[PDB]
């Protein structure tokens, strides 16, 4: 069942650590586990992960980094309206309330903290909206699925023409 | 049968003692899986105990003595929290906040030694929002969740839209 689910989303991502990041892969690995011990809404787990993907694409620096290299720090923010094709079936009703998480990230070479403030909620308006997947500017290349899996999201590169979310086994 | 949810406090402590230090993770599962060769513990907690032993084996830390001296390594683990698990085994009778200790020798091919576990599970009647048990896995180690779930005698499921729900205990 190819189900199109609409929602408004807001995301604010922050990273603190030493050993400032060089390659995007390490940042993506660090952020992929932002939900070590989730006690949020059960039904909202997968979509937040998709939104975390968005946050990953939007990592930013601040003048704090330009002021000293021994206090690494990254910011990021995104927001808007979108809709997602998915094959998870039916999602429960969703509310509009902010949610916040702060966790320690430990990949060895990189150690620090990651903070995510998300707010995803229903759009009861009846108007059409563009695709959520064709909303970023980081179209990169044909290994988009590899990045999604590295986070732990299975997507499609079939004749469908889009990157619809597929499944869990996000743990590996 | 249908999915039933069970919230509960858990507390865990595991120790493994052996020689020729303990190379790779596959032997971790294979060795620790024999903590209940002759079970005399409280039935009805077997699913919980197997899940809990798996959790503890996942993230066990080798002691500094392993680093310094190779004569007798030692592996330790300890955990505590409140988690909620989906299962379909049946209906569980009332639990209790009592500890349970197990201690057994093991011998898998080249490796031989002793396992000593101490666990405590007990149901919670509160209205808190506890995390899932699966999330308590670090995910920074091991590979695949069906095979390792089988190594302990534990059959699970991979629901597309959700998280893992048990099926039964192979044993």
């Amino acid at each position: 069942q190819l189900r199109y689910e609409k929602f408004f989303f807001t995301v604010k991502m922050t990273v603190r650590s030493n050993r400032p990041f060089r390659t995007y892969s390490d940042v993506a690995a660090a952020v992929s586990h932002w939900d070590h011990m989730y006690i949020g809404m059960a039904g909202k787990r997968p979509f937040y992960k998709i939104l975390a993907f968005l946050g990953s694409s939007n990592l930013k620096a601040t003048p704090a980094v330009l002021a000293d290299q021994g206090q690494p720090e990254y910011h990021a923010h995104c927001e808007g309206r979108a809709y997602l094709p998915h094959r998870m079936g039916k999602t429960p009703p969703m509310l509009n309330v902010p949610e916040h998480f702060r966790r320690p990230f430990n990949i060895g070479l990189y150690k620090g903290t990651i903070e995510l403030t998300m707010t995803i909620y229903d759009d009861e308006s009846l108007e059409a909206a563009p695709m959520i997947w064709d909303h970023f500017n980081s179209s990169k290349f044909s290994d988009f699925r590899e990045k999604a899996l590295m986070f732990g999201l299975i997507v499609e590169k079939k004749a469908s023409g889009a990157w619809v979310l597929d499944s869990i086994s996000h743990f590996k | 049968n249908q999915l039933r949810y069970e919230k509960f406090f858990f507390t865990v402590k595991m120790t493994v003692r052996s020689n020729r230090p303990f190379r790779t993770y596959s032997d971790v599962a294979a060795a620790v899986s024999h903590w209940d060769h002759m079970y005399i513990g409280m039935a009805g907690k077997r699913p919980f105990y197997k899940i809990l032993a798996f959790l503890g084996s996942s993230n066990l830390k080798a002691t500094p003595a392993v680093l310094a001296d190779q004569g007798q390594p030692e592996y330790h683990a300890h955990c505590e929290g409140r988690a909620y698990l989906p299962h379909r085994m049946g209906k569980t009778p009332p639990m209790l906040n009592v500890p349970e200790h197990f201690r057994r020798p093991f011998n898998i091919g080249l490796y031989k030694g002793t396992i000593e576990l101490t666990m405590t599970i007990y149901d919670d009647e509160s209205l808190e929002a506890a995390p899932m048990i699966w999330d308590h896995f670090n995910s920074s180690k091991f590979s695949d969740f069906r095979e390792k779930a089988l190594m302990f005698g534990l059959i699970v499921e991979k629901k597309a839209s959700g998280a893992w729900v048990l099926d039964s205990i192979s044993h």
Binding site: N18, N106, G108, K111 | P21, F22, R23, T24, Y25, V28, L60, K61, A62, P64, V66, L67, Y75, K141
Partner: peptide, 17 residues
């Protein structure tokens, strides 16, 4: 690195002045 479980990190940082 040749084994498993032989500490991880030791998060406490001695790699500093």
């Amino acid at each position: 690195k040749s084994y498993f479980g032989v500490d991880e990190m030791d998060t406490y940082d001695p790699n500093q002045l």
